[PDB]
Design a protein around this ligand. Sequence first.
Ligand code: A1H3D
Ligand code: ZN
Ligand code: ZN
Lengths: 115, 298
Amino acid sequence: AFAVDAAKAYKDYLASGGQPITNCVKMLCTHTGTGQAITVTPEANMDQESFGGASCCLYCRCHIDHPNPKGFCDLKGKYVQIPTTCANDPVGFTLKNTVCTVCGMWKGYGCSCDQ
Amino acid sequence: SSQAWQPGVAMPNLYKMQRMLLEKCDLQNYGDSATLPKGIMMNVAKYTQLCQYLNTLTLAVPYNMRVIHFGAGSDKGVAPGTAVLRQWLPTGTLLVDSDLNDFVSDADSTLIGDCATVHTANKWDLIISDMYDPKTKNVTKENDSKEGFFTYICGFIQQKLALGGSVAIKITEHSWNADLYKLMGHFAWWTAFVTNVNASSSEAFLIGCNYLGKPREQIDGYVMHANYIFWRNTNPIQLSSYSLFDMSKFPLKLRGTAVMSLKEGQINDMILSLLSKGRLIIRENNRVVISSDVLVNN
Ligand SMILES: Nc1ncnc2c1ncn2[C@@H]1O[C@H](CSCc2cccc(C(=O)O)c2)[C@@H](O)[C@H]1O
Ligand SMILES: [Zn+2]
Ligand SMILES: [Zn+2]
């Protein structure tokens, strides 16, 4: 029944005032992209930065198993768009947020499916 | 220096034709730094400019292109250069990377260990290497041709680079190999390319463009490295990040370059001419299979 809960540990570390995981790989791009959350090439819009996906994945970066049967990672090999105001902590952002499954934007950071 | 808006500077052909003696590299702009865009790492900027320059060459770009990237790890435990290569290469390109030390990567597959342990069943369309041993920067001893991973790279090119394929292999004043320069004469064209963001360093990428599998030109690698240092010593390059701000035409154009299997007897002058223009890749098109040798002991 025991499982390490790294997501909870990082969130609690952040809340206690710890400095976010660094050296996430920020890409050069046009910043005229679709703004969707996780894409095959950088798609940052004017309000986002694009990062190499593996470098923003808590499980990749901490060398721990991914939390699903398959152990699959949906960031590695892709690019993740982070709102520029949140780009100081890309790992925390991806952990704490959800991608809208119909439009592909971050819920609350681009998804307008509910207005 | 209208060069400041380029991604970097390639060694001019006349410098390749000299017969200079090797001297110490003394760069006028040593210790100067380019101002990188906010939050961008040097290695992202450097690989972006390398790829921008490769966009100007006659690279063969087949469907299911195969690219291998040596020296892809960082002391940060991530792979910025691999992330730029994956951004640059057409979607669906198979990208493998490798480093002595463990790291987290966006490549399709990653091998950890000395490059000499790496073996592949298949041939490759493009080989990128950033391998570098800082112990070579010993200004107090003679600067002779280095072996180590350069010996592996020379063999890997000769055995596992598809005809028509290309390479970009990092060198410095002290990290270089004479046989690798000689191998540049086995491509349709070659150069030493200096990125504008890192122009204060004796680093360059030795680029072989369209592999022919035989000497087109006989190059003395000791002379050619001396020629390279002479060029760098007499041509200060203005540090520049300008090209990083225009990424609208960054992605490598998927050219759908033909891939053919051909045995050594069928590579005629007409085939060699297609290879030389970036219009043909010669290799099998089976599955990509790789491995790392593990030494077992106690
Ligand atoms: N024989 C090999 N087999 C596989 N991998 C190899 C091999 N030799 C080197 N490497 C790998 O290539 C990269 C070379 S950089 C080292 C460096 C020097 C100065 C400054 C910096 C910096 O950036 O601060 C970095 C490293 O990752 C290194 O492990
Ligand atoms: Zn991951
Ligand atoms: Zn939505």
